[PDB]
Design a protein around this ligand. Structure first.
Ligand code: ATP
Ligand code: ATP
Ligand code: ATP
Ligand code: ATP
Ligand code: MG
Ligand code: MG
Lengths: 485, 492, 74
């Protein structure tokens, strides 16, 4: 044809954005990865989504797994392929070998198979084809050049037939050659690499479109997660800087704080509370989560440092009954150890729960605990993710950070998140006469005026009481002021 | 079946959590690793727990070790296989070669072996199968493709038989190919990798479930230990943030402290005492452990810096008789150099002893010492483990930390554990008039009010005496203050 | 000895034969092997590791021009 290469949607979450529309129609895409990367799942989801969203029949050619198994496995994702096979929308073509045995039936090899796939295609009026582990077929006794030819032959016949195909390959090195024979890379029109990178005893799955002959696509690796719903990719670099921005205000749950912020936090905003350990970030969170219930709004408190029970003990000791918020179905507590997941996973759990609960406010107690272990770059990516999501969803977010050093801290954040944020509330210890007092300061607020004082404050059962500034002192920011008389 | 694959529990501690229920029934799981990683043990434990806990017979196929040796080595874990063989619950089928000699044993091999296996399975009504090192079978003269097919044949036949199987393979590189031929990884539906990673001159064993076709499972490596009870895995990432939390108070063993903490520590709480060397962390510990005996409760003191003798000399000089606490069976001391093991080992020793003694209190004199060498992330993981265990077990835990720099310390912890902890007791030196005095502060307390004073304190034979704050000083925290007030008293 | 002209599988069989006969005889044996890399495969043919009951690795590590010998029971 005379125009811009057309793409078939995969409907696999996030993939069509990365690929700028989908898989190129009528050509085949190589998808390779090491064991357990999700090659097989990709290729099934491509067919399954075809059938269920466009009523495009599919043909799935298997060389190793058994059709019963392919079917059985899909149940993991709540997919009934046996039904689809019955309705004639899906056809799994068994090309695996005889557990029993013979060695002279496939002397007509590529040729013959190519006929059965063409027969199947015509028969079911197939639009999508997935060949699972072509690699395993020549893993009979071949050399690079022999593979290049067979692959080419196949790709080509399918091109003639007009089918959009997904071919699956295996690799042994996460960052080494693209597929086993260092030849499939160049014979396909498109290449997709699925990686399961190790790094620190944790595993991180990434998907990469290495090339799409004829169109554009997002470059590099994107994290993804295999869930009950199959492959889920987050193109964190595909999120646009187009979030809605209002002037409406909301309370912090602490009136005086509201005053200092020039009448409260903005609804559309990302508020950061930083401070040495024990300064009172968590008390603010409690208070901010409570204010959303007293106004009959839903709030989620994602906790990564305290148990659901402890959170309740400490909250109740500050007034506020978290128990009720729970029943009233106005407040939801989560709680998990940063270690019980990858940032990718965490991010999704968060999104996920936000979707099932549709909160108005959200508080993540200690981003600084989520940064444990992870790389700064991996972590920043996470923050932009959760931040950006809350921002485009009109949810007001309160995030917490504990600074590594009490008193004398020379930066707002050790991870340098402060720019990714709209409002920064800052808590610090101040040594006043052999005692450790606290001080709160609205460091910055983006669309408002806010107070510039570093007010001292106390914590009682009643909660946070913000008092006055240390007017008669110098170097209050050092943590060790110098009362000047 | 219209259901997603079901799993068989291995009962191997920690494994069913990592594998979300067990191994997939009717399929085979490839377990591979380098020499001495624990392959053979995993496979034996899988059959053993199969028989002892569900009365599911097992067939163990062996290609290299002798049935007598497999039975003999299992005695290391208190397992009498010879008995089970006897009662027809376990059947070791010997597939090893005879120390004499025959050629061309590749063909009939698989097939014969397969009905030998089928025969045995059918004969004993086996539900579980372990094939030990299939690897060694084609290690007769083969190339990758021949391996791939043979494997496939075998797995397949077993699938047909309906057996849940554990297959074992060797590797030569800790992070190299999954299994010798670079082919086994793909033929198997499930793959488990046992690693015995070096690093420093210590070895750390990890288990990873790489893939389970059909279901979910935890990802990554998990440290485990081989013990007299076999493989023991700690899914430190599977521990849930659901620990019970009470408002009950308990004493620190120092009244004045108790006041400062708004009436003593919380029963449910992790306490951290920090400060430069010689400030008295160990004194606080001793006192905290004694307090649990004087109340006839059990306490364990895991010490990593002092001998059991030294602890006793120093204790007695502070009053408190550790001798009695011992006899009375209320106090138990441990002691061990951080270097005499890996963090995984330590964590387990701690847990183990907490189970045999059921303490109400526990103190670890110096986390800081356990941090010697180990990486920060390995360490933090360790702390969350001991910390969380303590917490879900209602045991009050006091941990100690020596800061790397006396005076001027700008962070509570050098390893940044301060967020993992409920109450923080800080000890510091204060230079006052050419002399080194001490100060004690309750830096933070999660559920109470605590005192914000940086009180000076002395140490005598009576123990710790907490005096008053340094009100007329600026830069206390810095360790080197400055006195103030320029108006003594004059006329009108 | 097999450094005469052999491949991995031939070595595994021969070793196994020897070790086996020795165990029958009732002897407690120490068998020595060479390696070329201080941290690579355990022994030459990457096969002796699994054929023996116990494995001990002697290392002589370089690192900064000094040499440090270590013994490990693997
Ligand atoms: N419901 C589920 N929830 C979470 N993860 C799942 C679920 N089902 C399967 N998985 C995961 O997905 C993986 C499946 O990968 P898959 O079968 O797609 O093919 P593959 O890894 O590409 O290739 P191979 O045929 O070599 O195994 C499993 O290893 C497992 O980690
Ligand atoms: N009932 C109470 N009465 C007086 N002060 C309290 C009370 N509860 C807590 N506090 C004070 O508040 C502090 C608790 O801090 P909080 O739980 O708000 O979290 P944080 O400082 O933000 O974070 P983290 O606890 O992880 O360091 C304690 O140090 C203590 O001084
Ligand atoms: N009771 C025990 N306590 C602690 N460790 C033990 C005990 N018994 C055995 N071990 C350890 O476990 C190891 C046994 O490993 P195992 O026999 O399970 O198989 P392998 O290493 O997987 O394979 P192979 O030795 O056949 O190459 C020993 O090397 C030893 O380190
Ligand atoms: N009988 C005593 N009388 C007066 N002071 C004592 C007595 N015993 C110990 N001390 C003092 O207490 C200090 C001992 O410190 P302690 O045993 O409390 O542990 P630490 O400071 O926490 O840790 P570490 O000893 O490893 O540095 C000595 O430096 C000394 O000044
Ligand atoms: Mg907190
Ligand atoms: Mg000490």
């Amino acid at each position: 044809e005379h125009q811009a290469i057309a793409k078939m949607r995969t409907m696999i979450e996030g993939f069509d954005d990365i690929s700028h529309g989908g898989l190129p129609i009528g050509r085949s895409t190589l998808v390779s990865g090491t064991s357990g990367t999700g090659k097989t799942l990709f290729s099934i989801q491509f067919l399954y989504n075809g059938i269920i969203e466009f009523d495009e029949p599919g043909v799935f050619v298997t060389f190793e797994e058994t059709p019963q198994d392919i079917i059985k496995n899909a149940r993991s994702f709540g997919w009934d392929l046996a039904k689809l096979v019955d309705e004639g929308k899906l056809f799994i073509l068994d090309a695996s070998p005889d557990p029993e045995g013979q060695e002279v039936v496939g002397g007509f090899d590529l040729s013959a198979l190519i006929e059965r796939i063409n027969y199947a295609i015509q028969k079911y009026r197939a639009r999508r084809v997935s060949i699972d582990s072509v690699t395993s077929v020549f893993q009979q006794y071949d050399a690079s050049s022999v593979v290049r030819r067979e692959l080419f032959r196949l790709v080509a016949r399918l091109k003639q037939i007009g089918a959009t195909t997904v071919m699956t390959t295996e690799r042994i090195e996460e960052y080494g050659p693209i597929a086993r024979y260092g030849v499939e890379e160049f014979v396909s029109d498109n290449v997709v690499i699925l990686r399961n990178v190790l790094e620190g005893e944790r595993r991180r799955r990434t998907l990469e479109i290495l090339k799409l002959r004829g169109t554009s696509h997002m470059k590099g690796e994107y994290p993804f997660t295999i869930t009950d719903h199959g492959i889920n990719i987050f193109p964190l670099g595909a999120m646009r800087l187009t979030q809605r921005s209002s002037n409406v205000r909301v309370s912090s749950g602490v009136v005086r704080l509201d005053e200092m912020c020039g009448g409260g936090f903005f609804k559309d905003s990302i508020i950061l509370a930083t401070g040495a350990t024990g300064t009172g970030k968590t008390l603010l969170v409690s208070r901010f989560v409570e204010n959303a219930c007293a106004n009959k709004e839903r709030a989620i408190l994602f906790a990564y440092e305290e148990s659901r029970a402890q959170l309740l003990r400490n909250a109740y000791s500050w007034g506020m009954d978290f128990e009720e918020m729970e029943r009233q179905n106005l407040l939801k507590i989560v709680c998990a150890y940063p270690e019980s997941a990858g940032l990718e996973d965490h991010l999704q759990i968060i999104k996920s729960e936000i979707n099932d609960f549709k909160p108005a406010r959200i508080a993540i107690d200690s981003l600084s605990a989520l940064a444990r272990g992870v790389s700064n770059n991996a972590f920043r990516q996470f923050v932009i993710g959760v931040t950006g999501y809350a921002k485009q969803e009109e949810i007001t977010g309160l995030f917490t950070n504990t600074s590594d050093q009490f008193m004398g801290a020379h930066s707002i954040t050790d991870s340098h998140i402060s720019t990714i944020t709209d409002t920064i509330i800052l808590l610090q210890y101040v040594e006043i006469r052999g005692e450790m007092s606290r001080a709160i300061n609205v460091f910055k607020m983006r669309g408002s005026w806010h107070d510039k004082a570093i007010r001292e404050f106390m914590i009682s059962d009643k909660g946070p009481d913000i008092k006055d500034s240390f007017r008669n002192f110098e170097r209050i920011i050092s943590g060790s002021p110098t009362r000047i008389t």
